[PDB]
């Protein structure tokens, strides 16, 4: 192999996909309940997306941000129209690049006011990216192992433990970074009470609330933005994964007053906001908005069916669900694979389900059927 | 606007490209000598690239590195074939993500060996990216302002000043990061003598040599990798931009021994190595190696014509050229634009030229004529 050994790849290779199914060279069909880790929001070979991309490829792939990028304005408008207040967007290429932008925006925001707030409070079991800024925010030392020193200023509180947050907070704290639901961390849900308090603290202590919606964003949980389940009012949010339906894209959306700190030359990206990614993003956002009622309906159904299995605690909401097992779930992933079902195991014993947002109840029953056979 | 104000965009809206030409919303035609900052290596609507991408879009966009990605193997193989020794590749989505991966690999490398080397020496006027790790390596304080503290351990020496390197090198130095030719910094060329000694220092002081080829890589300077002009032997190189011909992609290539340190779970990327990016890279790499002789010839032709204008010092190699003017080049960019020519101004007074690698002499003459009339 000419590739570095940083991944633990499953012994399977796909060549094509269509709808919620993937196929290997052998022609064997696989029901996809991982969607490339919540990236293939519209499944594979989605007609509207496929046709749009084929057209864009022949027209213009990239010109860079040296020039005006109208397509960025169009997509941004659709993202901001769903935000709780007036806001602006900066486009990136991935979730980690998006979190990086949010951290830089938060720090410069206070510096612009002549205030020395540069610290951040994130949470244990969180995952915000692998690049240095995002890695420092990621509350999992195992991922830090060998790369220290990280960016100074990051401390880790505990999810649903408001007291752990108060303890790490001081007058030098720029922001609090959190995932409404921690995906990679085991589909851990921040409670309404905790989130409500977290918001109050940010208003009270004058600290920015930064929500990482890279995994929960764009309809994944049953609302366009997961923060909307609790009427939260984030200062900045990070987005990626499902936003591009398979095409690499990322973005941060900040409220007007905060966005102002991203002045000319303060930050940028070469590939960021290229016409291909924005074309894909435009298709996805319009489609997810129409699918939301279905995502809520199919999601509730899927959660109910999981509870019926009586094989562990069911976590999450919408189509970001988990099944906490008593044993390590690594082996179940292999057994499901042999049976033509793609599932994921994270946090050691939590099966993570991230099917495409176009998933139907019939496909759900098919997946539940396999689970009942292997658990 | 719905976009943050972090860019200083020229008032031109492109909508389509064909060959080495771009067309804006008014249908006006522009000869592209910037190629989106050296990204559109094969120009726009390149037949072979377009057909390959359209075919890929219909089949598979993304599966994630949870599974085997054969397309990653194929592209890596082609990139390693041109490397000076045996190595491995890690795929990212941008140049900044690539430099970040390199910094991480270098630090973990020494940790695996039981050693305490975590510092890096980079150079003034260098540009390696905007995310925290890369931002720390970037030797331009103006890009740091408001974002500190950065990742600890970075110091900046002076290009072609070997003594400035010694004054910063100690036993805790993990590696030296450099651009063979600093593009963004003003197309600054590292001398053969300097690079020779720098290579010497690394071997004798036992420090890793990391060359950032995001801008110089993939044929831009006449050779597949710019370091080949000096028979250098880097431990790690970073690539991006032109590698994808317009599609976002990035990567680091490291010789076998260093690559070993990227163990399972140590690093990763959700979008990294997706089939769309790899299909693009595969086409570009095959086409570019066939263009190398052409790049060298048209490149030398262009450089000579630039010298003939007698309007400044000509810098660069191959098709990465610059013209250092007596005063700011801000206005000339606009004047050239008005005359249907896209050029770039960097380092305040350096006009940078990065035409597509398929550019021909007839096209060069066209650009030269415009330059003669405006300079
Ligand atoms: C997956 C994920 C990331 C990383 O996204 P990348 O595109 O791999 O950089 C960051 N934050 C959260 C919450 C994620 O789920
Ligand atoms: C352009 C450039 C980068 C940044 O690449 P991005 O994709 O914008 O992160 C890094 N290093 C060098 C040498 C570059 O020219």
XYZ file of C-alpha atoms and ligand atoms in Angstrom:
780
model
C 0.000 0.000 0.000
C 1.138 3.528 -0.841
C -1.191 5.061 1.758
C -0.322 5.936 5.343
C -1.691 3.648 8.071
C -3.800 6.250 9.905
C -7.169 4.552 9.271
C -8.807 1.283 10.360
C -10.638 0.506 7.113
C -13.360 -2.142 6.838
C -12.485 -4.953 4.364
C -14.863 -3.728 1.657
C -14.606 -1.518 -1.410
C -17.541 0.101 -3.188
C -17.551 1.126 -6.840
C -21.038 2.554 -7.213
C -24.100 3.606 -5.288
C -27.691 4.559 -5.933
C -30.280 5.740 -3.465
C -29.576 4.285 -0.039
C -27.555 1.368 -1.439
C -23.874 0.838 -2.196
C -22.324 -1.885 -4.351
C -18.917 -3.572 -4.346
C -17.115 -4.899 -7.421
C -18.855 -8.237 -6.888
C -22.183 -6.498 -7.380
C -23.234 -7.216 -3.803
C -25.788 -4.724 -2.481
C -25.350 -2.864 0.820
C -28.007 -0.892 2.723
C -26.216 2.292 3.819
C -26.942 3.434 7.376
C -23.719 5.409 7.802
C -23.820 7.618 4.680
C -20.058 8.122 4.797
C -20.422 9.392 8.365
C -23.432 11.633 7.746
C -22.055 13.128 4.528
C -24.311 11.581 1.849
C -27.412 13.398 3.025
C -29.233 12.665 -0.238
C -27.856 9.176 -0.690
C -25.952 8.192 -3.816
C -26.525 9.299 -7.397
C -29.343 11.620 -6.304
C -30.836 12.757 -9.647
C -31.104 16.479 -8.921
C -27.610 16.626 -7.436
C -26.054 14.424 -10.101
C -27.413 16.476 -12.989
C -26.407 19.752 -11.332
C -22.841 18.586 -10.729
C -22.408 17.199 -14.250
C -23.459 20.594 -15.583
C -21.192 22.570 -13.245
C -18.152 20.404 -13.968
C -18.316 21.279 -17.659
C -18.861 24.960 -16.844
C -16.583 26.133 -14.025
C -14.934 24.300 -11.141
C -12.900 27.023 -9.476
C -11.752 30.647 -9.822
C -10.672 31.438 -6.227
C -11.728 34.202 -3.854
C -9.582 36.759 -5.718
C -12.835 37.453 -7.552
C -16.491 37.808 -6.656
C -18.132 34.415 -6.152
C -21.898 34.968 -6.728
C -22.679 31.307 -6.030
C -21.361 31.828 -2.494
C -23.875 34.622 -1.951
C -26.713 32.403 -3.137
C -25.878 29.507 -0.844
C -25.090 31.862 2.050
C -28.517 33.475 1.685
C -30.188 30.088 2.070
C -28.138 29.255 5.165
C -28.690 32.636 6.785
C -32.424 32.634 6.079
C -32.646 29.657 8.462
C -30.480 31.263 11.162
C -32.117 32.870 14.223
C -30.813 36.348 13.368
C -28.995 38.403 10.722
C -25.706 36.732 9.905
C -22.881 36.192 7.442
C -21.039 33.181 6.034
C -17.425 32.215 5.333
C -16.949 29.064 3.241
C -14.318 26.414 3.901
C -13.634 22.875 2.682
C -14.248 20.676 5.699
C -15.567 20.541 9.228
C -12.137 20.955 10.789
C -11.411 24.022 8.636
C -14.791 25.401 9.734
C -14.099 25.002 13.442
C -10.696 26.628 12.861
C -12.432 29.647 11.303
C -14.830 29.890 14.264
C -11.965 29.848 16.771
C -10.086 32.541 14.851
C -13.239 34.636 14.486
C -13.995 34.356 18.214
C -10.501 35.426 19.259
C -10.287 38.362 16.857
C -13.785 39.437 17.880
C -12.626 40.225 21.419
C -9.233 41.540 20.365
C -11.049 44.055 18.166
C -12.762 45.307 21.334
C -9.423 45.656 23.086
C -10.313 42.758 25.358
C -7.881 39.940 26.062
C -10.305 37.020 25.853
C -8.617 34.098 24.109
C -9.587 30.985 26.066
C -12.140 28.390 25.054
C -14.129 25.846 26.965
C -15.079 22.704 25.042
C -16.231 19.307 26.317
C -14.946 15.820 27.069
C -15.847 13.297 24.359
C -16.187 16.068 21.799
C -14.715 15.969 18.302
C -14.125 19.151 16.333
C -11.373 18.231 13.890
C -7.776 17.082 13.436
C -6.003 20.320 12.481
C -4.278 22.086 15.404
C -7.001 24.563 16.341
C -9.795 22.020 16.060
C -7.647 19.355 17.698
C -7.095 21.603 20.724
C -10.852 22.004 21.015
C -11.356 18.248 20.694
C -11.764 16.940 24.242
C -10.121 13.563 23.727
C -6.447 13.344 24.806
C -5.994 10.099 22.876
C -6.168 12.151 19.672
C -3.640 14.665 21.072
C -1.094 11.891 21.806
C 2.159 12.761 20.040
C 1.252 16.172 18.621
C 1.698 18.409 21.667
C 2.059 21.255 22.347
C -1.421 22.221 21.133
C -2.896 25.714 20.855
C -2.950 27.212 24.387
C -6.212 28.217 26.048
C -8.465 25.164 25.774
C -9.993 23.430 28.800
C -12.550 20.615 28.874
C -15.773 20.684 30.880
C -18.287 17.829 31.128
C -21.465 17.521 29.069
C -24.625 18.173 31.109
C -22.468 19.298 34.025
C -22.962 23.046 34.218
C -20.788 23.234 37.335
C -17.766 21.896 35.458
C -18.254 24.819 33.063
C -18.428 27.507 35.753
C -15.166 26.187 37.199
C -13.157 26.639 33.989
C -14.676 30.012 33.132
C -12.780 33.245 33.813
C -12.572 36.764 32.381
C -10.129 35.525 29.736
C -12.654 33.107 28.199
C -13.536 33.946 24.579
C -16.052 31.193 23.969
C -17.706 27.903 24.745
C -17.677 25.319 21.946
C -20.239 22.517 21.964
C -22.045 19.900 19.844
C -25.804 19.755 20.530
C -25.361 15.994 20.198
C -21.855 14.487 20.271
C -21.706 12.078 17.355
C -18.251 10.517 17.304
C -18.362 10.653 21.094
C -21.193 8.132 21.275
C -24.281 10.134 20.287
C -24.305 11.962 23.628
C -27.222 14.392 23.944
C -26.822 17.729 25.708
C -30.023 18.262 27.708
C -32.379 21.200 27.163
C -31.695 22.309 30.744
C -27.930 22.227 30.249
C -28.089 23.992 26.888
C -30.465 26.610 28.263
C -28.051 27.284 31.130
C -25.058 27.331 28.793
C -26.790 30.006 26.746
C -27.592 32.049 29.847
C -23.966 31.883 30.963
C -22.767 33.223 27.610
C -25.125 36.202 27.921
C -24.280 36.666 31.603
C -20.491 36.222 31.427
C -20.100 37.880 28.023
C -18.696 34.788 26.272
C -19.482 33.617 22.723
C -21.581 30.493 22.210
C -20.090 28.452 19.365
C -22.060 25.404 18.252
C -20.360 22.777 16.100
C -23.117 21.526 13.781
C -20.739 19.785 11.386
C -22.442 16.483 12.169
C -25.854 17.638 13.440
C -26.366 20.279 10.771
C -28.530 20.406 7.668
C -31.531 18.384 8.795
C -29.676 15.455 10.357
C -31.593 15.694 13.669
C -35.027 16.686 12.397
C -34.519 20.455 12.228
C -32.412 22.380 9.745
C -29.956 23.244 12.539
C -29.989 21.046 15.641
C -29.813 24.115 17.866
C -33.377 24.932 16.781
C -34.728 22.070 18.908
C -34.069 24.245 21.954
C -34.561 27.699 20.442
C -30.880 28.402 21.096
C -29.253 31.620 19.918
C -25.664 30.740 18.929
C -23.174 33.476 18.090
C -21.406 31.191 15.617
C -22.056 27.749 14.153
C -19.827 25.440 12.102
C -21.188 23.314 9.253
C -19.857 20.692 6.835
C -20.387 16.982 6.086
C -24.013 16.614 4.907
C -24.071 20.181 3.535
C -22.424 19.103 0.284
C -24.174 15.766 -0.172
C -20.796 14.197 -0.915
C -18.865 17.140 -2.302
C -16.299 18.665 0.088
C -17.552 21.858 1.730
C -17.595 23.599 5.100
C -18.740 26.915 6.514
C -19.224 29.044 9.585
C -22.242 31.286 10.042
C -21.945 34.055 12.626
C -24.349 36.771 13.721
C -23.732 40.161 12.086
C -21.936 41.927 14.945
C -19.505 39.012 15.378
C -18.987 38.410 11.634
C -17.677 41.979 11.333
C -14.345 40.953 12.869
C -13.483 38.886 9.792
C -11.958 41.858 7.978
C -10.067 41.897 4.634
C -7.000 39.671 4.779
C -7.804 38.325 8.244
C -8.597 34.832 6.952
C -9.205 32.946 3.719
C -9.147 29.701 1.756
C -8.080 28.823 -1.798
C -10.730 26.186 -2.539
C -13.278 27.645 -0.144
C -16.650 28.403 -1.700
C -15.756 27.142 -5.172
C -18.684 26.889 -7.626
C -18.838 23.089 -7.538
C -19.262 22.847 -3.759
C -21.736 25.730 -3.667
C -23.700 24.164 -6.517
C -23.910 20.964 -4.466
C -24.746 22.860 -1.286
C -27.569 24.746 -2.966
C -29.180 21.503 -4.094
C -28.858 19.876 -0.677
C -30.252 22.792 1.328
C -33.324 23.176 -0.887
C -33.960 19.450 -0.793
C -33.478 19.022 2.951
C -35.881 21.862 3.644
C -38.539 19.889 1.740
C -37.570 16.595 3.394
C -37.597 17.815 7.002
C -41.149 16.708 7.782
C -40.198 13.262 6.456
C -36.940 13.169 8.382
C -38.889 13.857 11.569
C -41.481 11.168 10.791
C -39.014 8.488 9.670
C -36.650 9.388 12.499
C -39.279 8.952 15.202
C -40.246 5.631 13.604
C -36.636 4.434 13.520
C -36.055 5.439 17.155
C -39.181 3.552 18.233
C -38.079 0.425 16.359
C -34.658 0.570 18.009
C -36.225 0.695 21.472
C -38.351 -2.311 20.520
C -35.133 -4.304 20.099
C -34.607 -4.271 23.853
C -30.857 -4.463 23.289
C -29.695 -1.238 24.916
C -30.313 2.472 25.472
C -31.409 4.379 22.356
C -29.857 7.829 21.992
C -30.168 10.834 19.698
C -32.989 12.264 17.625
C -34.086 12.637 14.025
C -31.759 10.498 11.925
C -28.744 10.793 14.232
C -29.383 7.787 16.452
C -27.383 5.443 18.622
C -27.772 2.087 20.331
C -25.642 1.763 23.449
C -24.666 -1.898 23.859
C -23.387 -3.747 26.904
C -20.504 -5.124 24.839
C -18.021 -3.591 22.399
C -19.820 -3.088 19.069
C -16.831 -3.573 16.756
C -17.740 -7.174 15.886
C -21.398 -6.384 15.205
C -20.284 -3.993 12.464
C -18.642 -6.907 10.656
C -21.637 -9.188 11.112
C -23.963 -6.494 9.761
C -21.619 -5.974 6.799
C -21.789 -9.652 5.821
C -25.573 -9.296 5.902
C -25.498 -6.321 3.539
C -26.012 -3.612 6.168
C -23.575 -0.777 6.806
C -23.456 0.417 10.401
C -20.874 2.185 12.548
C -19.389 1.594 16.004
C -18.089 4.494 18.048
C -17.196 5.156 21.682
C -16.478 1.446 22.017
C -20.023 0.171 22.499
C -22.341 2.603 20.731
C -23.693 1.686 17.316
C -24.073 4.936 15.390
C -26.756 5.151 12.710
C -26.502 7.902 10.093
C -28.629 6.830 7.113
C -29.219 9.216 4.181
C -31.993 11.732 4.894
C -34.045 10.207 2.056
C -34.325 6.928 3.983
C -37.801 5.339 4.110
C -39.624 3.215 6.697
C -39.283 0.160 4.454
C -35.492 0.556 4.505
C -35.702 1.070 8.261
C -37.493 -2.250 8.747
C -34.838 -3.907 6.600
C -32.074 -2.519 8.833
C -33.898 -3.313 12.086
C -34.382 -6.827 10.751
C -30.631 -7.349 10.426
C -29.980 -5.855 13.868
C -32.464 -8.239 15.472
C -30.560 -11.087 13.795
C -27.119 -10.045 15.057
C -27.697 -8.527 18.506
C -24.002 40.787 1.327
C -24.373 37.426 3.096
C -20.618 36.748 3.089
C -18.027 37.789 5.653
C -15.673 40.581 4.590
C -12.379 38.668 4.914
C -11.500 39.034 1.216
C -10.478 41.924 -1.036
C -12.315 40.678 -4.136
C -11.880 42.221 -7.593
C -15.239 43.367 -9.025
C -15.582 40.672 -11.698
C -18.079 37.808 -11.725
C -16.979 34.785 -13.732
C -19.572 32.262 -14.855
C -17.820 29.949 -17.288
C -14.403 28.951 -18.510
C -12.996 27.373 -21.657
C -9.347 26.478 -22.075
C -7.180 29.336 -20.829
C -10.062 31.823 -21.028
C -12.694 32.931 -18.524
C -15.979 34.740 -19.230
C -17.795 37.035 -16.811
C -21.520 37.800 -16.418
C -21.296 40.360 -19.252
C -19.781 37.756 -21.584
C -16.456 39.564 -21.648
C -13.486 37.323 -22.334
C -10.318 37.157 -20.223
C -6.973 35.424 -20.833
C -6.283 33.661 -17.534
C -2.741 34.099 -16.245
C -3.656 33.433 -12.614
C -5.507 30.095 -12.913
C -7.269 30.659 -9.586
C -3.864 30.965 -7.914
C -2.227 28.010 -9.652
C -5.157 25.662 -9.170
C -6.550 25.265 -12.681
C -3.451 23.431 -13.924
C -5.237 22.180 -17.066
C -7.329 25.300 -17.631
C -11.126 25.142 -17.756
C -13.420 22.571 -19.341
C -10.411 20.387 -20.113
C -12.026 17.507 -22.104
C -10.315 14.575 -20.384
C -10.943 16.068 -16.942
C -14.584 16.961 -17.627
C -15.494 13.545 -19.006
C -13.831 11.741 -16.089
C -15.587 13.894 -13.482
C -19.007 13.574 -15.110
C -18.561 9.803 -15.172
C -17.524 9.792 -11.497
C -20.365 12.038 -10.366
C -22.807 9.478 -11.802
C -21.223 6.634 -9.833
C -19.844 7.701 -6.467
C -18.964 10.988 -4.771
C -18.033 9.953 -1.223
C -17.898 6.810 0.955
C -15.433 7.914 3.722
C -12.220 6.304 4.927
C -14.295 3.851 6.984
C -13.900 1.617 3.935
C -11.251 0.804 1.330
C -10.715 3.615 -1.195
C -8.920 1.950 -4.167
C -8.844 5.278 -6.007
C -6.617 6.596 -3.204
C -4.162 3.740 -3.827
C -4.005 4.481 -7.559
C -3.341 8.198 -7.155
C -0.852 7.669 -4.317
C 1.070 5.233 -6.520
C 1.421 7.864 -9.248
C 2.565 10.511 -6.767
C 5.080 8.187 -5.100
C 6.484 7.106 -8.482
C 7.866 10.623 -8.941
C 9.151 10.961 -5.371
C 12.905 10.549 -4.777
C 12.432 7.474 -2.577
C 9.808 5.033 -1.302
C 6.980 6.753 0.527
C 3.323 6.895 1.476
C 0.516 9.418 1.069
C -2.233 10.871 3.252
C -5.066 12.674 1.444
C -6.533 15.947 2.707
C -8.769 18.617 1.130
C -6.560 21.678 0.993
C -3.056 23.000 1.167
C -3.506 24.140 4.767
C -4.849 20.744 5.875
C -1.805 19.218 4.180
C 0.746 21.363 6.000
C -1.141 20.605 9.222
C -0.780 16.857 8.560
C 2.949 17.324 7.928
C 3.518 19.216 11.196
C 1.627 16.541 13.111
C 3.501 13.674 11.433
C 6.872 15.292 12.146
C 6.103 15.780 15.843
C 4.721 12.281 16.335
C 7.666 10.861 14.389
C 10.157 12.021 17.029
C 7.823 11.018 19.859
C 7.692 7.460 18.529
C 11.496 7.456 18.562
C 11.630 8.502 22.214
C 12.961 11.972 21.407
C 11.865 15.456 22.488
C 11.807 17.425 19.238
C 8.713 19.548 18.716
C 9.912 22.903 17.379
C 9.922 24.033 13.769
C 11.911 26.581 11.846
C 10.092 28.176 8.923
C 10.913 31.308 6.939
C 9.982 34.971 6.743
C 7.606 35.810 3.877
C 6.430 32.211 3.809
C 2.795 31.185 3.490
C 1.630 27.743 4.570
C -2.037 28.215 5.411
C -4.606 29.850 7.677
C -5.575 27.067 10.099
C -3.667 27.257 13.411
C -0.878 24.780 12.709
C -0.163 26.224 9.276
C -0.734 29.755 10.520
C 2.007 29.198 13.082
C 4.402 28.062 10.335
C 3.475 31.070 8.188
C 6.198 33.646 8.772
C 4.058 36.743 8.339
C 2.952 38.335 11.651
C 0.228 40.315 9.892
C -1.718 37.067 9.448
C -1.294 36.235 13.149
C -2.666 39.471 14.627
C -5.732 38.863 16.774
C -5.441 35.080 16.689
C -2.640 34.503 19.230
C -1.562 32.438 21.023
C -0.527 30.244 18.097
C 0.871 26.725 18.330
C 4.080 26.978 20.385
C 7.442 26.128 18.882
C 7.695 28.081 15.641
C 10.467 30.531 14.757
C 11.234 32.306 11.493
C 14.617 32.349 9.766
C 15.561 34.224 6.597
C 15.564 32.695 3.117
C 19.049 32.319 1.616
C 20.512 33.169 5.029
C 21.883 29.897 6.380
C 23.210 31.585 9.520
C 19.703 32.680 10.529
C 18.824 28.983 10.498
C 21.681 27.997 12.824
C 20.753 30.731 15.305
C 17.358 29.043 15.697
C 18.242 25.358 15.464
C 18.646 23.377 18.692
C 18.222 19.752 19.799
C 14.464 20.266 20.291
C 13.953 21.192 16.632
C 11.735 18.617 14.913
C 12.000 20.008 11.418
C 12.463 22.831 8.943
C 9.559 23.936 6.705
C 10.229 25.721 3.427
C 8.901 26.657 -0.017
C 11.447 26.132 -2.826
C 9.963 29.317 -4.290
C 7.764 31.465 -2.029
C 4.783 32.340 -4.211
C 2.479 34.425 -2.027
C 5.549 36.056 -0.496
C 6.622 37.577 -3.801
C 7.914 34.647 -5.861
C 11.087 34.520 -3.762
C 13.617 31.935 -4.912
C 15.686 29.845 -2.506
C 19.208 29.635 -3.953
C 20.736 26.311 -4.946
C 23.584 27.007 -2.538
C 21.159 27.740 0.298
C 19.031 24.649 -0.353
C 22.197 22.548 -0.514
C 23.376 23.733 2.893
C 19.868 23.437 4.325
C 19.747 19.833 3.139
C 23.170 19.359 4.757
C 22.024 20.837 8.058
C 19.041 18.498 8.215
C 21.142 15.376 7.659
C 23.836 16.425 10.164
C 21.614 18.004 12.855
C 19.120 15.141 12.405
C 16.176 17.404 11.577
C 13.283 16.662 9.207
C 13.072 18.611 5.958
C 9.475 19.491 5.089
C 8.933 21.171 1.746
C 5.619 22.878 1.104
C 4.878 22.193 -2.576
C 1.228 23.282 -2.459
C 2.022 26.078 -4.899
C 5.158 24.778 -6.653
C 4.009 21.186 -6.988
C 2.569 19.159 -9.835
C 4.559 20.646 -12.725
C 4.164 24.358 -11.948
C 7.926 25.003 -12.138
C 8.851 22.675 -15.006
C 9.480 19.557 -12.920
C 6.818 17.385 -11.308
C 8.051 18.495 -7.868
C 10.006 21.752 -7.622
C 12.495 20.226 -5.170
C 13.782 18.096 -8.049
C 15.454 21.162 -9.561
C 17.971 20.904 -6.718
C 18.036 17.127 -6.252
C 16.737 17.600 -2.712
C 15.642 14.683 -0.533
C 12.735 15.914 1.629
C 11.327 13.734 4.390
C 7.854 15.170 3.775
C 6.233 17.364 1.128
C 2.787 18.983 1.051
C 0.700 19.197 -2.125
C -2.610 20.742 -3.173
C -3.982 23.410 -5.503
C -3.004 22.307 -9.026
C -3.149 18.612 -8.088
C -6.921 18.553 -8.470
C -7.170 20.779 -11.545
C -9.990 22.674 -9.863
C -11.405 20.002 -7.565
C -10.401 20.488 -3.879
C -7.656 18.087 -2.843
C -4.530 18.044 -0.730
C -1.930 15.568 0.447
C 1.353 14.965 2.150
C 3.859 12.453 0.838
C 6.426 11.174 3.325
C 9.254 8.707 2.940
C 8.515 5.252 4.400
C 10.254 5.675 7.750
C 8.485 8.890 8.702
C 5.120 7.762 7.308
C 5.182 4.893 9.800
C 4.243 7.304 12.590
C 0.768 7.921 11.210
C -0.715 4.940 13.018
C -4.407 3.919 13.213
C -6.520 6.674 14.735
C -3.670 9.187 14.872
C -5.087 11.340 12.067
C -7.831 11.444 9.465
C -10.173 13.479 7.271
C -13.844 12.916 6.472
C -13.698 14.212 2.870
C -10.054 13.312 2.322
C -9.410 10.968 -0.589
C -12.978 10.870 -1.853
C -13.390 9.329 -5.352
C -14.163 12.659 -7.040
C -10.953 14.351 -5.888
C -8.885 11.273 -6.705
C -10.384 10.938 -10.188
C -9.381 14.554 -10.816
C -5.891 14.072 -9.434
C -5.383 10.943 -11.516
C -6.222 12.828 -14.703
C -4.089 15.835 -13.784
C -1.046 13.791 -12.817
C -1.082 11.827 -16.083
C -1.621 14.934 -18.203
C 0.882 17.073 -16.317
C 3.797 14.676 -16.654
C 3.249 14.812 -20.429
C 3.296 18.624 -20.248
C 6.537 19.032 -18.289
C 8.723 19.604 -21.367
C 6.144 22.121 -22.631
C 5.960 23.906 -19.279
C 9.739 24.314 -19.349
C 9.829 25.631 -22.923
C 6.862 28.009 -22.845
C 7.965 28.990 -19.348
C 11.447 30.028 -20.464
C 9.916 31.840 -23.435
C 7.606 33.796 -21.126
C 10.383 34.636 -18.659
C 12.557 36.018 -21.457
C 9.738 38.173 -22.838
C 9.091 39.528 -19.344
C 12.758 40.499 -19.085
C 12.448 42.162 -22.495
C 9.812 44.583 -21.215
C 12.552 46.164 -19.123
C 10.052 47.064 -16.418
C 11.557 45.216 -13.475
C 13.297 42.184 -11.995
C 11.923 38.887 -13.329
C 11.690 36.075 -10.780
C 10.545 32.476 -10.770
C 10.976 29.251 -12.694
C 8.864 27.420 -15.273
C 5.353 28.876 -15.217
C 5.624 30.335 -11.725
C 6.938 33.771 -12.596
C 6.934 37.208 -11.054
C 7.781 40.747 -12.106
C 8.924 42.959 -9.248
C 7.891 46.520 -10.058
C 9.213 49.791 -8.674
C 5.838 50.644 -7.145
C 2.622 48.952 -6.008
C 1.117 46.597 -8.596
C -2.433 47.181 -7.364
C -3.439 49.405 -10.299
C -1.913 47.252 -13.035
C -4.144 44.346 -12.035
C -7.191 46.515 -12.760
C -5.763 47.932 -15.989
C -4.884 44.445 -17.212
C -8.343 43.241 -16.203
C -9.964 45.985 -18.268
C -7.870 44.804 -21.221
C -8.999 41.190 -20.903
C -6.011 39.864 -18.948
C -6.061 38.344 -15.472
C -2.847 38.877 -13.517
C -2.106 38.926 -9.784
C -0.359 41.346 -7.429
C 1.364 40.051 -4.317
C 3.953 41.241 -1.784
C 2.679 44.697 -2.673
C 4.908 45.191 -5.715
C 5.254 41.764 -7.314
C 3.050 40.841 -10.249
C 2.657 37.068 -10.086
C 1.835 34.989 -13.171
C 0.346 31.502 -12.809
C -1.184 30.610 -16.181
C -2.647 27.131 -16.784
C 0.075 24.626 -17.619
C -1.462 24.118 -21.081
C -0.643 27.726 -21.985
C 1.027 28.210 -25.397
C 3.482 30.741 -26.850
C 0.768 32.480 -28.871
C -1.076 33.076 -25.585
C 2.094 34.292 -23.883
C 2.527 36.891 -26.634
C -1.022 38.104 -26.051
C -0.332 38.642 -22.350
C 3.029 40.283 -23.039
C 1.399 42.767 -25.424
C -1.085 43.835 -22.742
C 1.733 44.154 -20.213
C 3.792 46.262 -22.613
C 0.818 48.601 -23.004
C 0.077 49.020 -19.285
C 3.421 48.826 -17.486
C -16.764 14.967 11.603
C -16.688 16.184 12.452
C -15.625 17.166 12.317
C -14.513 16.990 11.302
O -15.019 17.272 10.000
P -13.835 17.075 8.912
O -14.473 17.382 7.468
O -13.295 15.558 8.957
O -12.716 18.001 9.152
C -15.648 18.289 13.153
N -16.636 18.450 14.066
C -17.637 17.567 14.231
C -18.696 17.822 15.272
C -17.703 16.405 13.435
O -18.717 15.505 13.596
C -1.851 28.521 -1.260
C -0.874 27.897 -0.337
C -1.268 27.278 0.917
C -2.722 27.252 1.363
O -3.438 26.290 0.586
P -4.991 26.274 1.055
O -5.703 25.270 0.231
O -5.631 27.731 0.814
O -5.140 25.886 2.595
C -0.267 26.703 1.713
N 1.030 26.726 1.321
C 1.443 27.291 0.171
C 2.905 27.280 -0.195
C 0.514 27.896 -0.700
O 0.930 28.469 -1.870
